[PDB]
Motif scaffolding. Structure first.
Motif, PDB file in Angstrom:
ATOM      1  N   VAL A  34      36.651  54.355  35.983  1.00  0.00           N
ATOM      2  CA  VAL A  34      37.699  55.274  36.415  1.00  0.00           C
ATOM      3  C   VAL A  34      37.690  55.397  37.937  1.00  0.00           C
ATOM      4  CG1 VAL A  34      37.500  56.589  34.212  1.00  0.00           C
ATOM      5  CG2 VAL A  34      36.442  57.470  36.357  1.00  0.00           C
ATOM      6  N   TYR A  35      38.892  55.506  38.473  1.00  0.00           N
ATOM      7  CA  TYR A  35      39.143  56.025  39.804  1.00  0.00           C
ATOM      8  C   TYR A  35      39.957  57.294  39.615  1.00  0.00           C
ATOM      9  CZ  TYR A  35      40.320  56.344  44.724  1.00  0.00           C
ATOM     10  OH  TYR A  35      40.372  56.749  46.037  1.00  0.00           O
ATOM     11  N   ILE A  36      39.575  58.379  40.277  1.00  0.00           N
ATOM     12  CA  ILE A  36      40.281  59.645  40.091  1.00  0.00           C
ATOM     13  C   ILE A  36      41.129  59.876  41.324  1.00  0.00           C
ATOM     14  CG2 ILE A  36      40.113  62.114  39.830  1.00  0.00           C
ATOM     15  CD1 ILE A  36      37.596  61.673  38.256  1.00  0.00           C
ATOM     16  N   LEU A  37      42.444  59.874  41.127  1.00  0.00           N
ATOM     17  CA  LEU A  37      43.412  59.935  42.209  1.00  0.00           C
ATOM     18  C   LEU A  37      43.950  61.358  42.269  1.00  0.00           C
ATOM     19  CD1 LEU A  37      44.960  58.504  44.391  1.00  0.00           C
ATOM     20  CD2 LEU A  37      46.677  57.886  42.671  1.00  0.00           C
ATOM     21  N   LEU A  56      44.960  50.697  47.634  1.00  0.00           N
ATOM     22  CA  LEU A  56      45.666  50.277  46.417  1.00  0.00           C
ATOM     23  C   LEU A  56      45.354  48.824  46.079  1.00  0.00           C
ATOM     24  CD1 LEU A  56      49.121  52.074  46.776  1.00  0.00           C
ATOM     25  CD2 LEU A  56      47.083  52.714  45.429  1.00  0.00           C
ATOM     26  N   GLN A  57      45.281  47.957  47.094  1.00  0.00           N
ATOM     27  CA  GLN A  57      44.909  46.568  46.835  1.00  0.00           C
ATOM     28  C   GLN A  57      43.469  46.438  46.367  1.00  0.00           C
ATOM     29  OE1 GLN A  57      45.947  44.553  50.507  1.00  0.00           O
ATOM     30  NE2 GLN A  57      47.965  43.958  49.708  1.00  0.00           N
ATOM     31  N   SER A  58      42.573  47.303  46.867  1.00  0.00           N
ATOM     32  CA  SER A  58      41.203  47.325  46.357  1.00  0.00           C
ATOM     33  C   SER A  58      41.152  47.747  44.889  1.00  0.00           C
ATOM     34  CB  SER A  58      40.353  48.260  47.203  1.00  0.00           C
ATOM     35  OG  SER A  58      40.307  47.776  48.538  1.00  0.00           O
ATOM     36  N   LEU A  59      41.899  48.793  44.517  1.00  0.00           N
ATOM     37  CA  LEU A  59      41.971  49.159  43.101  1.00  0.00           C
ATOM     38  C   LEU A  59      42.634  48.064  42.264  1.00  0.00           C
ATOM     39  CD1 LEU A  59      42.909  52.915  43.377  1.00  0.00           C
ATOM     40  CD2 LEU A  59      40.581  51.834  43.299  1.00  0.00           C
ATOM     41  N   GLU A  60      43.700  47.432  42.770  1.00  0.00           N
ATOM     42  CA  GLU A  60      44.308  46.350  41.984  1.00  0.00           C
ATOM     43  C   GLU A  60      43.317  45.205  41.775  1.00  0.00           C
ATOM     44  OE1 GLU A  60      46.994  46.443  40.209  1.00  0.00           O
ATOM     45  OE2 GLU A  60      48.717  47.283  41.278  1.00  0.00           O
ATOM     46  N   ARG A  72      40.539  47.298  31.682  1.00  0.00           N
ATOM     47  CA  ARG A  72      41.454  47.824  32.691  1.00  0.00           C
ATOM     48  C   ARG A  72      40.692  48.853  33.516  1.00  0.00           C
ATOM     49  NH1 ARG A  72      47.169  47.835  32.293  1.00  0.00           N
ATOM     50  NH2 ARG A  72      46.989  48.693  34.437  1.00  0.00           N
ATOM     51  N   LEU A  73      41.106  49.025  34.754  1.00  0.00           N
ATOM     52  CA  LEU A  73      40.739  50.217  35.494  1.00  0.00           C
ATOM     53  C   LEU A  73      41.564  51.396  34.986  1.00  0.00           C
ATOM     54  CD1 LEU A  73      39.130  51.357  37.969  1.00  0.00           C
ATOM     55  CD2 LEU A  73      41.238  50.947  39.318  1.00  0.00           C
ATOM     56  N   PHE A  74      40.920  52.545  34.833  1.00  0.00           N
ATOM     57  CA  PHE A  74      41.622  53.777  34.483  1.00  0.00           C
ATOM     58  C   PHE A  74      41.836  54.562  35.768  1.00  0.00           C
ATOM     59  CE2 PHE A  74      41.419  54.141  29.781  1.00  0.00           C
ATOM     60  CZ  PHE A  74      40.613  53.063  29.510  1.00  0.00           C
TER      61      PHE A  74
END
Ligand SMILES: O=C1NCCN1C[C@H](O)Cn1c2ccc(F)cc2c2cc(F)ccc21
Length: 490
Positions: A34-37, A56-60, A72-74
């Motif tokens: 998870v990443y918490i946005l 955002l590119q790092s999370l993608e 998937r990343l959540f």
């Protein structure tokens, strides 16, 4: 008994050297990343497009890596203290892992999350892989205070163990085997948002100057350590014109976001040294060790990024001068060297360390006498490799506000640019309205005769501003003011 684990990404945006993620996966029957946005983060922040794009590119990139494992990343929207109790219950979480955050606010956030996890019967594993060292051990060895000079810092780590080796890779098979089933409608709530969804202009097809993510970070690490780049970056570096441009081997944004492990970098650099020279000096690691020094100074100082109430910061009566600060921030000082650097910073998100010296000097003790706190804020908005620790630490150091043992001069905001790029082409690149000035005047165009300004189609005071201070007079007064501030302490 197999855990149901959540690995929480904040920094450490990578799968390599991720001991917290290893802890999540080992003995797990189920793992979610998870990443918490925080949906209201931007309401109280002014961070610019280049940092958002890089995040955002790092999370993608992480999501793309997880998709290779049928996962998937959540991207969970909310505040951690609101989200984690629901997630724990809704997912039946038994273990939460994350890379340690040493910064005062993150430490307090994480301590609250750890109390809530403990209350809910959730195990927590943290690992301190954002830095080379256990910062708390350094402080403990120094009598429970951080070192405030770099040589003392080096003395302390010289009697400590070496940084941990990078953790071994997480098994692809193990992580695909223990994956949580992804629902087909995952992107209703957990997708990585596009830049345009955040109100930014439409992105082109061409690559960003600093593409985010672990994949890019590792490719850059490989090029960085080619023997052909050894002399250029480690044997005999030179701050020349080409040095000002963003390098395809540059690593500092990746280190700041955690796309690149600092321990992997450290030991691969050691490896290359041993191949080239057949035990390296500490200076080989200087970029990482200065970073570590500022992290150690920040971790126990909640007011690290402020003047008042900051126990290591000298109290200096800086000018309240919002007009000058705004001219500095927007590259409208009338000093082409300063303005070109600030334009490169805004356009691309990275500027050379010596260019940071130049613009910070100009804002603070060199020219405008504006608080370093305002420079911190602008760099937080625009600089890809800024964080709480290294940004405020560097600004305090540069402005002689903290860590002070000896005075050092600020660079001349004309002469330093002239010396670094005698051609002027750095100026022409970022300030094209000055492009017709000959090299003799382009760093000081107010000194060009009327003939030259007309041929350059740029009339100073009209098409480009006059310099907003007399540097010779102002810097001499500022030096006298700083000397008195320090001498009177006795
Ligand atoms: O050159 C030297 N000598 C000792 C350390 N160092 C390298 C500096 O850390 C480079 N640097 C930064 C890096 C990250 C960041 F977010 C802000 C800054 C920054 C602000 C300044 F005002 C001046 C220099 C700055």
């Amino acid at each position: 008994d197999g855990a149901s684990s959540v690995h929480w990404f904040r920094k450490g945006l990578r799968l390599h050297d991720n001991p917290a993620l290893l802890a999540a996966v080992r003995g797990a029957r189920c793992v979610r990343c998870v990443y918490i946005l925080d949906p209201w983060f931007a309401a109280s922040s002014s961070v610019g497009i280049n940092r958002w794009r890089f995040l955002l590119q790092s999370l993608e990139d992480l999501d793309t890596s997880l998709r290779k494992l049928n996962s998937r990343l959540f991207v969970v929207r909310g505040q951690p203290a609101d989200v984690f109790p629901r997630l724990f219950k809704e997912w039946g979480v038994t273990r939460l892992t994350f890379e340690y955050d040493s910064e005062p606010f993150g430490k307090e956030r994480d301590a609250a999350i750890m109390k809530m996890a403990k209350e809910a019967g959730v195990e927590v594993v943290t690992e301190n892989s954002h830095t080379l060292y256990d910062l708390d051990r350094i402080i403990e060895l120094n009598g429970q205070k951080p070192p405030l000079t770099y040589k003392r810092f080096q003395a302390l780590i010289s009697r400590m163990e070496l940084p941990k080796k990078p953790a071994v890779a997480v098994s692809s098979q193990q992580m695909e085997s223990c994956r949580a089933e992804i629902q087909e409608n995952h992107d209703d709530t957990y997708g990585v948002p596009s830049l345009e969804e955040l109100g930014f202009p439409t992105e082109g097809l061409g690559p960003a100057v600093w593409q985010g993510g672990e994949t890019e970070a590792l490719a850059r690490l490989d090029k960085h350590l080619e023997r052909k780049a050894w002399v250029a970056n480690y044997e005999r570096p030179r701050m020349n014109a080409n040095s000002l441009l963003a390098s395809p081997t540059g690593l500092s944004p990746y280190l700041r976001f955690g796309c690149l492990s600092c321990r992997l970098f450290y030991y691969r650099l050691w490896d290359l040294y041993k191949k080239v020279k057949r035990t390296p000096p500490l200076s080989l690691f200087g970029q990482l060790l200065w970073r570590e020094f500022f992290y150690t100074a920040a971790t126990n100082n909640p007011r690290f990024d402020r003047m008042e109430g900051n126990p290591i910061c000298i109290q200096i009566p800086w000018d309240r001068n919002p007009e000058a600060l705004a001219k500095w921030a927007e590259g409208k000082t009338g000093f082409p060297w300063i303005d070109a650097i600030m334009t490169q910073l805004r356009q691309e998100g990275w500027i050379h360390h010596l260019a940071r010296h130049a613009v910070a000097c100009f804002l603070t003790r060199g020219d405008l006498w504006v608080s370093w706190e305002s420079g911190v804020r602008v760099f937080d908005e625009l600089l890809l490799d800024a964080d709480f620790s290294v940004n405020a630490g560097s600004w305090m150091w540069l402005s002689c506000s903290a860590f002070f043992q000896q005075f050092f001069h600020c660079y001349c905001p004309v002469g330093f640019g002239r010396r670094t790029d005698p051609s002027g082409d750095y100026i022409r690149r970022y300030l094209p309205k000055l492009k017709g000035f000959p090299s003799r005047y382009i760093y000081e165009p107010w000194n060009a005769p009327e003939s030259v300004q007309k041929a350059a189609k740029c009339i100073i005071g009209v098409d480009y501003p006059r310099p907003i201070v007399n540097h010779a007079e102002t810097s001499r007064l500022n030096i006298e003011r700083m000397k008195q501030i320090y001498q009177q302490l006795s």
